[PDB]
Amino acid sequence: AKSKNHTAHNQSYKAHRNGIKKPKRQRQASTKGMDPKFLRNLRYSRKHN
Amino acid sequence: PAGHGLRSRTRDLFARPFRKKGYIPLTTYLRTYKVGEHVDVKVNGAVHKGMPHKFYHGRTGRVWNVTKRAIGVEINKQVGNRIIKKRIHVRVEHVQPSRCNEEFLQRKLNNDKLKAEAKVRGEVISTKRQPAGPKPGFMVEGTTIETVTPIPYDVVNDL
Amino acid sequence: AAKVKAAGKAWYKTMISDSDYAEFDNFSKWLGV
Amino acid sequence: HRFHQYQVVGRALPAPGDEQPKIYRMKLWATNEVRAKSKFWYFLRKLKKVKKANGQMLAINEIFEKNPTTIKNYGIWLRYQSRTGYHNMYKEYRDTTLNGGVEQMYTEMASRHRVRAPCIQIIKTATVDFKLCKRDNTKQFHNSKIKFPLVYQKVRPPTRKLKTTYKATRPNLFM
Amino acid sequence: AEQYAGEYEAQDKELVQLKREARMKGGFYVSPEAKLLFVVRIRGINAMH
RNA sequence: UAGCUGGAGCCCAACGAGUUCUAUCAGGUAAAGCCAAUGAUUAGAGGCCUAUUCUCAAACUUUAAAUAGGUAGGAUGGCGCGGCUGCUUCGGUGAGCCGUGCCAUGGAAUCGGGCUCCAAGUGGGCCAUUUUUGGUAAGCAGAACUGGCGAUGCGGGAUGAACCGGAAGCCGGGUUACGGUGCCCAACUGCGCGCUAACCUAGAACCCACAAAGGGUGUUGGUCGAACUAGCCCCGAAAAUGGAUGGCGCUGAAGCGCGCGACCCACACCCGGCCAUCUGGGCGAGCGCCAUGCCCCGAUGAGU
Ligand SMILES: [K+]
Ligand SMILES: [K+]
Ligand SMILES: [K+]
Ligand SMILES: [K+]
Ligand SMILES: [K+]
Ligand SMILES: [Mg+2]
Ligand SMILES: [Mg+2]
Ligand SMILES: [Mg+2]
Ligand SMILES: [Mg+2]
Ligand SMILES: [Mg+2]
Ligand SMILES: [Mg+2]
Ligand SMILES: [Mg+2]
Ligand SMILES: [Mg+2]
Ligand SMILES: [Mg+2]
Ligand SMILES: [Mg+2]
Ligand SMILES: [Mg+2]
Ligand SMILES: [Mg+2]
Ligand SMILES: [Mg+2]
Ligand SMILES: [Mg+2]
Ligand SMILES: [Mg+2]
Ligand SMILES: [Mg+2]
Ligand SMILES: [Mg+2]
């Protein structure tokens, strides 16, 4: 017995029930993934303020 | 992976524009990007290091990191229910500064100057944009008027 | 009053004017040119 | 009257390129003003290159019959779309107003050719002297001694209060 | 309320004078474009895009 | 397993938005092109070459839409003064950050109240407008966007999961949608112009319940001249129980095309009463109350 393979039917309706969620705009965006140089230096500058 | 490679169906997308191949101009290489700036992503197919995935071609995002040969760009991606703020690193060859806020940046300076005048004169003003609306009444002088008529149908001249 | 009437008659003549119809060369006989 | 004649005046929007654009006028037949302006913008878009979004509407005025108590002969040149192709034809009518002739034209095209109002374009309207009328059934009513009987009477009560299901005798009608 | 009632007139009347004067010197006066709409929904809430 | 759903909350009220506008990016589908590259492809002309020429492309393309895509449209901003850095520069040179004093009429339209836990069922789908692949085709087989049925009654399409209208507490009154007004059947045998005559069962409601090439000196409108065109009608037109514009029937129609006025008509819309849900309120030196109560206000009511 064969069946259906793929469809996007009803998927966007499902996606909008709790309508598309935009991430929370936060002050002080995370510094993860920034280059470690200028990251340790910023840490040293803050420590010596 | 899983049926489609990294550069699948990019035959037209990553090709260079017509008669615009070969050397890359120096302007591409000495533009300055800072964290918080807006940039458009446009892959060029002659530079294979730092190449972003085909999804980010034609998307605009914020600069969040700057390295020696690349910048960090933050781009929204809708994945089912929500938007994921994707963070990718792209070489400067595939990125250009965005003009999506150029009209806003000049307007902010002008609104500051206009409100400065209202401070001097003591008035209260708005400096807030308003959409195009209904035109006011006006008069037009008596001039030549051309008459427009439906044209008789001609079979021969239809083609 | 007479100037009022003349403007109304001038306006009425413009409203009821008819085109030359001379630019339809091959349909000139079929039309009332 | 079902149909009215309007004179619609408009132009392209004044732009720095011209700033005093040309003025265009049309005489259009429509049921009201909103339908007259729409048909005007239809012809301006197709004949000139000015559509409603790039244009300005200046004036719209209804034309009226000068003498609605006399009988005129009315010629109409029209363009219509059939099931297979486009054709133009000339029609003649007798009416006290050109409004009646246009209503007559639209009714006749609907009956004889099954052509609806959207598929018709009035090329030209005019009044024709009885010496220059071309179609038959218009000349035969130019007889000054015109005489004939009424061959279909339509026996009916006058005001629907006098209507009864039954009658005691058959009607007598004669002509 | 007296001020508004007398303002509805002299606005209708002024447009009558303006149009007459335009014809008086042979031109067209263009009425100001409408600024207000009344919008009424004529279809139901079934099978909506 | 994630998504869709319920329950429990809790945290708060400028934040947003399945929308437009202003600005700014990105694209190679439709169309087009070959008189541009790659490929295919007909014909002559002039001297293999030159200038033309007919016709083409899902795995061709210089150009190149519509519709969809992304970003931005301030109080989470800006400017001085002063500091810190182990980073950066020839260099206070920069990149940032820290402190501090000032400035910022709220920066287009419209609309609006919106972090975590635990868990159910589901994981056979089907149909329709548009786009679209395979196949001669299929009530076939497979994709894209949206809606619908499934899970849903109610009015119309005679009848019918999906078509048209419209979604719903129990009622009174008024009015409509779709569809209709000869009878069945509530509402005109209403007012008006044409066309048709069927000796084929003439014809007569989207989906829909079929018809073609081709014909006619049937008839009625047109066009071009000294035949052509297109309306209705007729031929083309053959299946098995007896039979179906739904039936009877209808011929200045009760058929076809186009109008006018009124009328009929849904659980839809409006006003009103009542039940419930939700929202927001009032009630103590209490003559004071199933306070888990009573009173007031507004909206709402489909369900496997
Ligand atoms: K493949
Ligand atoms: K082209
Ligand atoms: K070619
Ligand atoms: K499961
Ligand atoms: K015929
Ligand atoms: Mg199947
Ligand atoms: Mg399955
Ligand atoms: Mg895998
Ligand atoms: Mg519907
Ligand atoms: Mg292509
Ligand atoms: Mg094509
Ligand atoms: Mg689950
Ligand atoms: Mg089921
Ligand atoms: Mg079932
Ligand atoms: Mg009622
Ligand atoms: Mg009748
Ligand atoms: Mg049926
Ligand atoms: Mg035939
Ligand atoms: Mg029936
Ligand atoms: Mg009620
Ligand atoms: Mg319920
Ligand atoms: Mg249950």
Automatic annotation (TrEMBL), chain A:
Family, per entry: Belongs to the eukaryotic ribosomal protein eL29 family.
Q: Which keywords does this chain's UniProt record carry?
A: Metal-binding, Ribonucleoprotein, Ribosomal protein
Show the segment(s) annotated as Disordered: 1-49
What ranges does the record list as Basic residues composition bias? Answer: 14-27
- One GO BP annotation here? cytoplasmic translation
Record's superkingdom? Eukaryota
Q: What is this protein called?
A: 60S ribosomal protein L29
In terms of the parent sequence, the fragment covers 2 to 50 of 60
Q: Which residues bind Mg(2+)?
A: N5
GO molecular function term, any single one:
structural constituent of ribosome
**Which cellular components does GO assign to this protein?**
cytosolic large ribosomal subunit
Automatic annotation (TrEMBL), chain B:
Question: What are the entry keywords?
Answer: Metal-binding, Ribonucleoprotein, Ribosomal protein
A GO term from the CC aspect: ribonucleoprotein complex
Protein origin, superkingdom: Eukaryota
Q: Does the keyword Ribonucleoprotein apply?
A: yes
Q: Name one Pfam family in it.
A: Ribosomal_L21e
From the UniProt record, which GO molecular function terms apply? structural constituent of ribosome
Asked if the Swiss-Prot or TrEMBL record annotates the protein with the keyword Ribonucleoprotein, the reply is yes
List this protein's GO terms for biological process.
Answer: translation
Q: Where does Mg(2+) bind?
A: D12
Family, as annotated: Belongs to the eukaryotic ribosomal protein eL21 family.
Task: Name it.
Answer: Ribosomal protein L21
Organism, by scientific name, is Triticum aestivum
Please name the taxonomic classification of the source. Answer: Eukaryota, Viridiplantae, Streptophyta, Embryophyta, Tracheophyta
Automatic annotation (TrEMBL), chain D:
Q: Does the keyword Kinase apply?
A: no
Sorted UniProt keywords? Ribonucleoprotein, Ribosomal protein
Per the UniProt record, one Pfam family is Ribosomal_L18A
Residue stretches making up the Large ribosomal subunit protein eL20 domain: 4-125
Q: Does the keyword Ribonucleoprotein apply?
A: yes
What do the Gene Ontology cellular component annotations say?
A: cytosolic large ribosomal subunit
InterPro entries referenced in this protein's UniProt entry, alphabetically: Ribosomal_eL20, Ribosomal_eL20_dom, Ribosomal_eL20_eukaryotes
Q: Would you kindly state one Gene Ontology biological process term found in this protein's UniProt entry?
A: cytoplasmic translation
One example of the protein's molecular function in GO is: structural constituent of ribosome
Could you say which protein family the record assigns here? Belongs to the eukaryotic ribosomal protein eL20 family.
Protein name, entry field: 60S ribosomal protein L18a
Which organism encodes this protein?
A: Triticum aestivum (Wheat)
Q: Which gene encodes it?
A: LOC123146086
Automatic annotation (TrEMBL), chain E:
Q: Which domain of life is it from?
A: Eukaryota
Family statement drawn from the similarity comment of this UniProt entry: Belongs to the universal ribosomal protein uL30 family.
What's the protein name?
Uncharacterized protein
Protein source organism: Triticum aestivum (Wheat)
